[PDB]
Amino acid sequence: NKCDVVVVGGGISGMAAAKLLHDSGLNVVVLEARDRVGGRTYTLRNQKVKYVDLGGSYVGPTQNRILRLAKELGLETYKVNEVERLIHHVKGKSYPFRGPFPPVWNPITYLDHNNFWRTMDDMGREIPSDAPWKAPLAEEWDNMTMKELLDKLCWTESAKQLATLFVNLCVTAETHEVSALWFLWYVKQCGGTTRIISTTNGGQERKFVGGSGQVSERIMDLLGDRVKLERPVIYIDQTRENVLVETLNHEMYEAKYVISAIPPTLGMKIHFNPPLPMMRNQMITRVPLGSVIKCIVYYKEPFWRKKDYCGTMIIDGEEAPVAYTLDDTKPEGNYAAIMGFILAHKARKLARLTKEERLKKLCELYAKVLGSLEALEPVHYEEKNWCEEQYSGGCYTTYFPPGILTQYGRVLRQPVDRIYFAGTETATHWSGYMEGAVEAGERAAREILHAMGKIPEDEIWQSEPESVDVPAQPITTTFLERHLPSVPGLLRLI
Amino acid sequence: NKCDVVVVGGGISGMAAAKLLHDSGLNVVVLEARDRVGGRTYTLRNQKVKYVDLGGSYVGPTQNRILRLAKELGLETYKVNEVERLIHHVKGKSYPFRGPFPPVWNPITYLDHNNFWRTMDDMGREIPSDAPWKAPLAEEWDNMTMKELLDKLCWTESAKQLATLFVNLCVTAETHEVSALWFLWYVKQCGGTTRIISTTNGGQERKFVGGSGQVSERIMDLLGDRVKLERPVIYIDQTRENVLVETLNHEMYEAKYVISAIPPTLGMKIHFNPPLPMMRNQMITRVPLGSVIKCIVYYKEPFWRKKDYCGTMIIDGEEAPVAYTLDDTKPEGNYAAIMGFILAHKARKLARLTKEERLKKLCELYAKVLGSLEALEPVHYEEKNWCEEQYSGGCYTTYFPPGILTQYGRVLRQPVDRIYFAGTETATHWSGYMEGAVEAGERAAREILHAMGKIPEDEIWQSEPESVDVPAQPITTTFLERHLPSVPGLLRLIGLTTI
Ligand SMILES: *[C]C1=C([C])[C]=C2C(=[C]1)N([C][C]([O])[C]([O])[C]([O])[C]OP([O])(=O)OP([O])(=O)O[C][C]1O[C](N3[C]=NC4=C3N=[C]N=C4[N])[C]([O])[C]1[O])C1=NC(=O)[N]C(=O)C1=N2[C]/[C]=[C]/N([C])[C]C1=[C][C]=[C]O1
Ligand SMILES: *[C]C1=C([C])[C]=C2C(=[C]1)N([C][C]([O])[C]([O])[C]([O])[C]OP([O])(=O)OP([O])(=O)O[C][C]1O[C](N3[C]=NC4=C3N=[C]N=C4[N])[C]([O])[C]1[O])C1=NC(=O)[N]C(=O)C1=N2[C]/[C]=[C]/N([C])[C]C1=[C][C]=[C]O1
Numbered sequence: 002n003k004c005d006v007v008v009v010g011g012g013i014s015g016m017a018a019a020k021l022l023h024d025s026g027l028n029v030v031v032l033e034a035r036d037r038v039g040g041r042t043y044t045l046r047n048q049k050v051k052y053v054d055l056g057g058s059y060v061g062p063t064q065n066r067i068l069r070l071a072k073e074l075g076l077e078t079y080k081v082n083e084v085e086r087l088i089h090h091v092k093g094k095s096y097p098f099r100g101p102f103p104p105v106w107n108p109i110t111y112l113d114h115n116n117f118w119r120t121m122d123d124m125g126r127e128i129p130s131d132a133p134w135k136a137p138l139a140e141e142w143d144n145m146t147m148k149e150l151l152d153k154l155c156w157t158e159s160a161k162q163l164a165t166l167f168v169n170l171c172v173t174a175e176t177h178e179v180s181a182l183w184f185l186w187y188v189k190q191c192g193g194t195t196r197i198i199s200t201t202n203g204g205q206e207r208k209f210v211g212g213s214g215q216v217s218e219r220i221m222d223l224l225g226d227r228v229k230l231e232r233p234v235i236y237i238d239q240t241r242e243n244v245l246v247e248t249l250n251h252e253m254y255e256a257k258y259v260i261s262a263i264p265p266t267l268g269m270k271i272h273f274n275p276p277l278p279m280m281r282n283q284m285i286t287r288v289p290l291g292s293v294i295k296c297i298v299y300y301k302e303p304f305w306r307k308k309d310y311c312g313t314m315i316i317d318g319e320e321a322p323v324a325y326t327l328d329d330t331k332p333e334g335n336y337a338a339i340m341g342f343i344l345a346h347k348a349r350k351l352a353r354l355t356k357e358e359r360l361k362k363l364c365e366l367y368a369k370v371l372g373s374l375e376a377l378e379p380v381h382y383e384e385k386n387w388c389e390e391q392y393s394g395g396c397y398t399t400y401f402p403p404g405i406l407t408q409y410g411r412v413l414r415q416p417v418d419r420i421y422f423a424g425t426e427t428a429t430h431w432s433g434y435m436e437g438a439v440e441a442g443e444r445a446a447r448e449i450l451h452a453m454g455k456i457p458e459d460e461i462w463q464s465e466p467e468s469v470d471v472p473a474q475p476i477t478t479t480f481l482e483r484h485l486p487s488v489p490g491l492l493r494l495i
Numbered sequence: 496n497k498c499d500v501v502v503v504g505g506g507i508s509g510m511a512a513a514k515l516l517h518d519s520g521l522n523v524v525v526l527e528a529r530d531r532v533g534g535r536t537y538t539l540r541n542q543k544v545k546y547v548d549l550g551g552s553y554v555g556p557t558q559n560r561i562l563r564l565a566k567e568l569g570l571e572t573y574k575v576n577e578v579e580r581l582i583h584h585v586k587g588k589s590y591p592f593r594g595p596f597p598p599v600w601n602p603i604t605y606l607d608h609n610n611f612w613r614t615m616d617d618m619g620r621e622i623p624s625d626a627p628w629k630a631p632l633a634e635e636w637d638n639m640t641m642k643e644l645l646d647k648l649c650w651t652e653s654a655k656q657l658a659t660l661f662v663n664l665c666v667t668a669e670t671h672e673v674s675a676l677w678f679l680w681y682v683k684q685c686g687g688t689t690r691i692i693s694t695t696n697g698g699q700e701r702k703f704v705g706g707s708g709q710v711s712e713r714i715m716d717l718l719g720d721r722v723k724l725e726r727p728v729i730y731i732d733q734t735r736e737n738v739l740v741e742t743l744n745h746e747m748y749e750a751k752y753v754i755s756a757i758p759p760t761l762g763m764k765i766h767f768n769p770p771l772p773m774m775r776n777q778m779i780t781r782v783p784l785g786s787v788i789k790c791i792v793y794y795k796e797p798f799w800r801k802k803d804y805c806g807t808m809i810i811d812g813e814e815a816p817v818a819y820t821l822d823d824t825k826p827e828g829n830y831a832a833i834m835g836f837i838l839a840h841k842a843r844k845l846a847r848l849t850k851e852e853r854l855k856k857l858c859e860l861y862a863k864v865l866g867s868l869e870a871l872e873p874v875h876y877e878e879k880n881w882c883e884e885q886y887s888g889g890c891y892t893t894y895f896p897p898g899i900l901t902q903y904g905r906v907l908r909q910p911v912d913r914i915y916f917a918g919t920e921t922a923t924h925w926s927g928y929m930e931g932a933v934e935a936g937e938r939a940a941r942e943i944l945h946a947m948g949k950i951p952e953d954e955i956w957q958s959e960p961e962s963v964d965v966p967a968q969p970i971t972t973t974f975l976e977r978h979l980p981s982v983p984g985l986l987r988l989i990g991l992t993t994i
Binding site for chain 1: 637639743760764772773777780781782784840843846896898
């Protein structure tokens with residue numbers, strides 16, 4: 002019934018908000034729609050897999066807030082297997098390579114590839130993390146799709162296809178669906194191209210021992226009966242003295258403040274009184290989430306390591322169900338597995354198949370790419386299609402179509418009276434990730450602390466010391482990488 | 496509590512569905528979120544305006560379903576004033592003209608203008624009304640915004656600026672926001688460029704005497720207590736034998752079938768058990784509605800008629816708050832008024848201002864455009880920002896961003912068990928209009944009549960006899976219009992000759 006703060010949503014962001022508020026002495030309730038906590042993180046346990054992350058999973062250097070919070074809850078990380086060679090599959094053949102970036106041998110293509118990545122980071126350096134709509138060329142970039150940008154930038158098919166897979170993999174959407182401004186902001190606010198695509202020294206360096214769902218589970222352990230499972234919020238009333246929040250199962254909660262820790266578009270599932278201000282009312286219909294099936298195939302052994310393959314596969318082309326894989330073996334070398342993502346339009350298309358039919362296609366792909374019959378002999382399979390989720394709306398995150406970020410972006414974290422906004426979408430560093438969820442939960446919580454007079458305005462946004470366990474190495478470029486010309490730049494010299 | 500069919504939404508579509516179902520003997524309930532029916536039509540009544548349409552208003556030839564419904568309910572239409580000259584205001588100057596299209600004197604520019612409209616209709620013929628994603632080039636066109644399409648087509652800035660204004664005005668959205676496939680579909684399923692833009696012989700020919708709000712109000716009168724105002728639906732349960740529909744004020748309704756007659760994205764406001772299938776679940780997060788403020792400025796007299804202007808203005812300019820106006824004077828000649836639309840990003844921008852500052856900017860614009868100081872003497876002002884409506888989401892309608900219509904389009908009107916889908920967005924002819932509302936409402940109702948074994952399958956889709964009161968002149972082209980070359984076509988002709 003009555004409390005200081007109602008938090009809507011028990012994902013990482015809501016749980017981190019509620020934990021902070023509770024630790025500071027306020028009475029908090031968390032209202033969660035599902036029969037579990039975690040949201041877009043979900044750890045399945047069974048004897049065959051032991052545990053497996055079917056939702057968010059990877060963490061890495063510079064994500065110091067998720068690392069600190071998990072550490073305090075008694076979680077530990079291990080490193081994703083990247084000891085052996087990566088594979089680029091292109092035109093029906095496997096090219097093994099080392100390093101984050103698949104190599105290119107033709108000199109024209111080389112220039113084109115080099116220029117494309119470098120140009121993404123140049124454009125990023127003009128986009129403010131906390132206000133992408135203030136970029137000098139904000140409207141121009143916002144009014145093009147990433148498909149247009151790539152059509153302008155990439156003078157070769159090879160670069161255009163690799164840059165396309167890069168978009169698909171990062172934001173689970175087609176290049177033609179997304180704003181160029183938003184995608185460039187996204188990459189940049191993750192620390193740039195190298196940091197976002199790298200396993201070693203990047204976002205995919207690590208996983209949590211036991212699963213990432215333990216983060217939310219253990220915060221729910223700390224809050225006891227303050228978390229209400231199967232309480233979907235349907236109505237928020239701000240007209241009266243205290244804020245009133247009603248659930249689907251008929252309960253009424255009453256508080257001074259609310260934190261909305263749900264994806265923006267999921268705001269639509271709530272009837273507000275008074276109506277939302279105009280800009281928010283429309284923003285929340287303009288911001289879908291992407292489409293992904295996360296798929297994990299289990300094998301008796303990590304047989305790929307015998308051939309000096311780490312298990313990472315970058316797979317070009319329309320026919321491949323999966324464009325990107327990582328080794329999902331446990332740190333002990335057991336429960337051998339390959340993780341793959343069926344991305345964007347391939348998720349819409351392959352979801353009509355059965356579970357077994359998807360297994361077969363994956364097994365056959367992997368056998369081709371890894372060049373082993375061992376890939377045809379899986380011992381177990383697990384998958385999750387996030388598009389079918391009523392209370393996520395997709396995965397990994399919310400994407401912005403052309404024109405939206407400049408028109409409505411300012412409203413995302415703007416308080417509506419006594420509702421403050423959390424969720425990974427409202428973050429400024431690794432928004433879209435578990436790290437962003439923590440940043441935004443803790444920030445929304447601290448905005449409420451300040452509206453209550455408990456902390457000054459300068460403590461709303463707090464910096465995070467670097468993890469000692471997962472230190473960050475700097476991102477370096479070579480001299481040639483910085484100064485080799487683009488394709489049209491080599492033409493102007495001729 | 497118990498009925499045969501719960502209709503969610505009491506706009507034209509919901510009210511047309513309910514009426515048909517009622518007229519066939521079934522027990523229906525209409526559950527409407529607001530304290531009124533009509534939805535995106537709303538007729539305001541006070542002594543200063545008598546009546547005024549702040550939402551949907553215009554009807555015209557080929558929109559035979561809304562004309563039959565309104566006529567059966569006792570309503571009349573009248574002709575929007577187009578006796579005197581239209582104005583095209585471009586680069587700070589007004590160019591009076593007659594006919595539907597602003598004319599063009601520079602021959603190069605003339606070629607580009609003729610080709611643009613012609614290619615809109617040409618691409619249109621490739622696109623089936625009932626299945627736009629079946630166009631041979633659906634994918635290619637859907638992965639392109641209307642801004643990209645215009646950048647390819649228009650070799651003159653003049654044609655590109657006119658085309659941009661045409662998109663903004665038709666779909667209340669920027670060229671860079673909307674799919675080219677969707678937009679070409681939307682224009683074709685209204686009968687083409689000419690039909691869509693015209694007053695005389697087009698979409699804007701007429702209005703209803705007393706306002707379009709009476710359509711919904713009269714159906715509510717026929718239905719009596721079957722219409723429940725202030726019952727926003729929060730929850731639909733299909734796991735049991737009868738379908739369970741719950742409202743925000745804690746009432747429960749039970750039915751064999753449900754028609755959802757709300758904008759697709761407002762389907763988000765309902766919690767579903769079991770969950771919606773994947774494709775609908777994501778589609779309803781991908782389909783926003785446009786942005787528009789409709790504004791009416793009243794004057795003592797329709798002073799523009801005296802300078803031989805009908806009061807239609809096509810106003811190109813970033814500075815112009817309004818890009819299109821019409822004479823909104825009563826058929827009797829009194830309550831003289833200019834209606835104007837504030838479109839897309841200007842609705843966003845100018846909503847910051849007060850009512851009085853918006854009035855001031857409109858009057859000043861109209862003064863310049865009409866060359867008339869009288870325009871600075873309004874007697875009254877009415878307006879509505881549709882963007883702030885929780886139970887509409889915007890106006891006029893739903894637009895599809897790039898990539899959405901080919902991936903999700905096929906599910907807009909796919910039944911989900913015993914839920915069936917109405918709303919003008921599900922129509923095949925004048926989707927986005929009051930006409931499409933009636934088509935979709937009636938089609939969804941007849942879908943349920945078929946599931947119940949009361950009519951055969953071929954009676955679900957039913958054609959409509961032509962209005963004898965608002966008959967349609969066919970759309971014609973001249974030989975020159977059809978065969979004059981494009982700008983690149985003339986340039987190809989040149990390179991070939993000089994060889
Ligand atoms: C799904 C997914 C996948 C499959 C994958 C991934 C992901 C995902 N990610 C992301 C994450 O997960 C996120 O970000 C997070 O989680 C977020 O969180 P938040 O913010 O908290 O949110 P959520 O979770 O959703 O929560 C919410 C909640 O709420 C609720 N609700 C709703 N509604 C409502 C409610 N309640 C009450 N009422 C109402 N109405 C719900 O239920 C929930 O609970 C990720 N991340 C990270 O970090 N990592 C990872 O890994 C991930 N993943 C992925 C990634 C990928 N990548 C990166 C790609 C690549 C590779 C290479 C390069 O790139
Ligand atoms: C808004 C507007 C404006 C401003 C203008 C216009 C329009 C609009 N339009 C359109 C119309 O209006 C529409 O279409 C209709 O109305 C629709 O119908 P429906 O489908 O029925 O839908 P609605 O109305 O929305 O209704 C729905 C209902 O539901 C409810 N809900 C929600 N949610 C819920 C509910 N309930 C319960 N529960 C829940 N949850 C609500 O409340 C409602 O009631 C139009 N149309 C026509 O026809 N005409 C006209 O005029 C119009 N307008 C416009 C147009 C213009 N133009 C076209 C111009 C031009 C020129 C050149 C080119 O263009």
